[PDB]
Structure 1
Amino acid sequence: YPLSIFFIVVNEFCERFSYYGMRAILILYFTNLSTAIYHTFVALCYLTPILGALIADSWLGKFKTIVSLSIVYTIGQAVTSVSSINDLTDVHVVLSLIGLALIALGTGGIKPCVSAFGGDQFEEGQEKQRNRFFSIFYLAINAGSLLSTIITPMCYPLAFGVPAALMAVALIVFVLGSGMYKKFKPQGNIMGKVAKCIGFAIKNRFRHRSKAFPKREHWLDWAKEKYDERLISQIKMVTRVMFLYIPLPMFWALFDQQGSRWTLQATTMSGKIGALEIQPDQMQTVNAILIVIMVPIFDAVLYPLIAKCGFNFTSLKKMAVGMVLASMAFVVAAIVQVEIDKTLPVFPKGNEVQIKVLNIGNNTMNISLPGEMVTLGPMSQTNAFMTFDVNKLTRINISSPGSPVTAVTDDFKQGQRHTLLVWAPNHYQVVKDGLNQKPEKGENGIRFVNTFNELITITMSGKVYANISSYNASTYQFFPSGIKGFTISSTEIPPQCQPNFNTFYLEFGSAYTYIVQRKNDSCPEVKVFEDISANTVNMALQIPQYFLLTCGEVVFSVTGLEFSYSQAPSNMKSVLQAGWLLTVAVGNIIVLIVAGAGQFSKQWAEYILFAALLLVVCVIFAIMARFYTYINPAEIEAQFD
Structure 2
Amino acid sequence: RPADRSKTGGWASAAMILCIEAVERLTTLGIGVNLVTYLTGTMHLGNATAANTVTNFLGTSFMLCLLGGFIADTFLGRYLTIAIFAAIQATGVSILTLSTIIPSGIQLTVLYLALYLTALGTGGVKASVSGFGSDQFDETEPKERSKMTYFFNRFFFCINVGSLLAVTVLVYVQDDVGRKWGYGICAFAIVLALSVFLAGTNRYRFKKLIGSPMTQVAAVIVAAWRNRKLETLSTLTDVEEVKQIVRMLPIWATCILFWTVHAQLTTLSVAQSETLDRSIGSFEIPPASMAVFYVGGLLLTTAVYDRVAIRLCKKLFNYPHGLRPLQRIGLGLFFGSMAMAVAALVELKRLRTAHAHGFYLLIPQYLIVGIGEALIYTGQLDFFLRECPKGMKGMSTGLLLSTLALGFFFSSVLVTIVEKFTGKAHPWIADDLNKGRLYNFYWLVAVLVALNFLIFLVFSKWYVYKEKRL
**Could you give the per-residue CA deviations for residues 561-604 of structure 1, whole angstroms, max 9, x where no partner exists?**
45455656555556443331122222223332333365655333
1:104 to 119, 123, 126: 119
Q: How far has the Cα of 1:155 moved from its partner?
A: 7.2
1:74-113 map, 5 Å? 74-82=90-98, 87-88=102-103, 98-113=113-128
Pick closer, same or farther for the CA change 1:609–1:561 going to 2, 3 Å. same
Aligned to 1:499: none
Residue 423 of structure 2 corresponds to residue 603 of structure 1: no
Shift of 1:553: 1.0
Alpha-carbon distance in 1 for matches of 2:394, 2:126: 10
Q: Does 1:624 align with 2:444?
A: no
Q: CA RMSD in A?
A: 4.1
In the alignment, structure 1 residue 30 sits paired with structure 2 residue 43: yes
How is 1:83-232 mapped onto 2 (pairs within 5 angstroms)?
Answer: 87-88=102-103, 98-115=113-130, 121=137, 136=157, 139=160, 142-143=163-164, 145-146=166-167, 147-152=169-174, 153-154=176-177, 158-175=181-198, 176=200, 179=203, 183-186=207-210, 191-200=214-223, 203-204=226-227, 207-208=230-231, 227=234, 229=236, 231-232=238-239
Contact residue 82 and residue 125 of structure 2 kept, 8 A: yes
Match of 1:609, SS state, is helix
Counterparts of 2:180 and 2:107 in 1: how far apart (Å)? Answer: 16
Q: Tell me, in whole angstroms, the C-alpha distance in 1 between the residues paired with 2:73 and 2:345.
A: 49
Q: Which amino acid aligns with 2:440?
A: W
Aligned counterpart for 1:15 among listed residues 24, 35, 44: 24
Give the secondary structure class of the aligned counterpart of 1:541. coil
Distance 1:273 1:163, change over 3 A: closer
Residues 297 and 370 in structure 2, CA contact (< 8 A), matched pair in contact too: yes
Larger CA Rg, structure 1 vs 2? 1
- 8 Å CA contact 1:69–1:109 kept in 2: the answer is yes
Contact persistence 2:51–2:267 (CA under 8 A)? yes
Q: Which residue of 2 aligns with 1:339?
A: 349
Match of 1:250 in 2: 257
Partner AA of 1:309 in structure 2: K
TM-score (norm 2): 0.73
Paired with 2:282 and 2:91, the residues of 1 have a C-alpha distance of 44
Match for 1:59 among 71, 75, 100?
Answer: 75
**CA 1:237–1:62 in 2, change beyond 3 Å: closer, same or farther?**
farther
* 1:297 pairs with 2:304: yes
Distance 1:78-1:568 versus aligned 2 partners, 3 A rule: farther
CA distance in 1, matches of 2:354, 2:111: 42
Q: Mean Cα displacement is larger for which, 549-558 or 155-164? A: 155-164
Percent identical pairs in the alignment equals: 23
1:14–1:167: 8 Å Cα contact kept in structure 2? yes
- The answer for unaligned runs of 5 or more in structure 2 is 1-8, 429-436
What amino acid is the match of 1:186? I
Residue 556 (1) aligns with residue 376 (2): yes
Higher helix content, 1 or 2: 2
The structure that is strand-richer by fraction is 1
- Provide the residue aligned with 1:323 in structure 2: 333
| Residue type at the aligned position of 1:304 | I
| Distance of aligned partners of 1:568 and 1:106 in 2 relative to their CA distance in 1, 3 Å threshold | farther
Alignment map for 1:234-383 (pairs within 5 Å): 234-270=241-277, 272-274=279-281, 277-299=284-306, 301-310=307-316, 312=318, 313-345=323-355
The CA deviation at 1:122 is 8.6
Q: 1:280 to 1:117 in 2, by over 3 A?
A: same
The residue matched to 1:186 in structure 2 has which SS? coil
- The CA deviation string for residues 399-457 of structure 1, in whole angstroms up to 9 with x for no partner, is xxxxxxxxxxxxxxxxxxxxxxxxxxxxxxxxxxxxxxxxxxxxxxxxxxxxxxxxxxx
Which of 1 and 2 has higher RCO (CA within 8 Å, sep 6+)? Answer: 2
The aligned amino acid for 1:19 is: T
Q: Any residues of structure 2 matched to 1:440-459 within 5 Å, and which?
A: none
Shift of the alpha carbon at 1:245?
1.2
Structure 1 length normalisation: TM-score? 0.55
Q: Distance in 2 between matches of 1:169 and 1:234?
A: 44
